[PDB]
Amino acid sequence: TYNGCSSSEQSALAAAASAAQSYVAESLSYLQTHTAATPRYTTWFGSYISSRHSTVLQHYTDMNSNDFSSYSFDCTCTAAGTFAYVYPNRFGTVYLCGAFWKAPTTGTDSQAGTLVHESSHFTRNGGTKDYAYGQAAAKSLATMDPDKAVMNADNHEYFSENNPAQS
Ligand SMILES: *[C@H]1O[C@H](CO)[C@@H](O)[C@H](O)[C@@H]1O
Ligand SMILES: [Zn+2]
Numbered sequence: 804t805y806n807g808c809s810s811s812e813q814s815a816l817a818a819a820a821s822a823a824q825s826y827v828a829e830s831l832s833y834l835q836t837h838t839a840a841t842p843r844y845t846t847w848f849g850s851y852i853s854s855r856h857s858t859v860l861q862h863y864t865d866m867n868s869n870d871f872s873s874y875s876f877d878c879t880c881t882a883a884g885t886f887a888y889v890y891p892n893r894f895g896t897v898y899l900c901g902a903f904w905k906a907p908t909t910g911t912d913s914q915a916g917t918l919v920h921e922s923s924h925f926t927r928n929g930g931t932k933d934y935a936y937g938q939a940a941a942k943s944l945a946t947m948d949p950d951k952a953v954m955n956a957d958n959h960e961y962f963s964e965n966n967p968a969q970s
Contacts (some may be wrong), residue, residue, distance in 0.1 A: 808878035812899070818908050820871040822915030823922070826963040827871075830919075831863040843969040846942060847962040849949025858953045859962075862929035866922050869895075874918075886917045894925045911938070911966045920960035931956040 805813050837844060840851035848859055873895070880888070880900035887899045897918065907913050923931040934951045935944040941961050945952040952958045 804875045806875070806877040806879065808876060808899075812878050812904070813876075815904070815908070815914060816876050816899070817872070819914035819918055820874060822909050822913075823918035824871045826909075826915055826919050827863060827866045827869075827922070830959075830963045831860075831867045834860040834863055841970060843962065843965060845945070846969060847945055847952065847958045849945040849952050852949075855949060855953045858929070859959070862923055862931070862953075862959065865928040866919070869922055869925075869928065871918060871922070886912070887921050889921045889924050891924050891926045891930050894927050897921050909964075911961075911964055913964060916960045916964040919963045920956045923956045923959040929954075931959060933957070 805816070808816065833843070834856065838856065844851060844856070848855060875896040877896065877898040880898050883901040885900040886902045886906065887897055889897050903914060903917060906917065909915050922928055931954050932951075934948075934955045935941050936957055938961055941952070941955065941957045944955055945958060
């Protein structure tokens with residue numbers, strides 16, 4: 804259900820939800836077929852170790868079972884610095900803010916990518932936190948503290964967006 808969303812916002816959300824589902828699907832597949840260190844993995848999740856790979860694999864397995872198109876969306880927030888937000892314990896509802904409408908459907912810091920970021924926050928999906936924001940900080944987190952990287956929402960978003968594309 805939509806709450807406080809204009810017609811244009813509903814249309815953008817519909818496209819973003821479908822793209823986010825695709826992002827999660829492709830990301831899950833990647834994690835299932837790559838069971839050793841690769842550029843795309845280490846860049847966002849740090850040094851490859853089975854434990855952490857299992858952690859992210861679980862997150863995407865859970866998110867893949869989510870139906871993004873059936874999520875409830877709320878467009879009342881007007882915070883320009885925030886893309887969106889959710890309550891980890893209240894699954895299925897995403898609250899969109901100002902920056903969301905200025906973001907492209909797909910790509911880096913995209914609407915679709917933001918939904919992946921927010922979905923990862925739900926406890927049912929792994930309950931990621933926000934230890935770092937942005938590609939620069941996310942990459943730094945992956946190198947310096949991989950344990951937090953696999954529990955950081957933006958690292959999941961960037962791994963999924965994969966832009967620039969990495970093998
Ligand atoms: C992440 O780090 C690994 C190093 O183990 C590379 O394989 C990859 O290119 C990326 O920089
Ligand atoms: Zn977040």
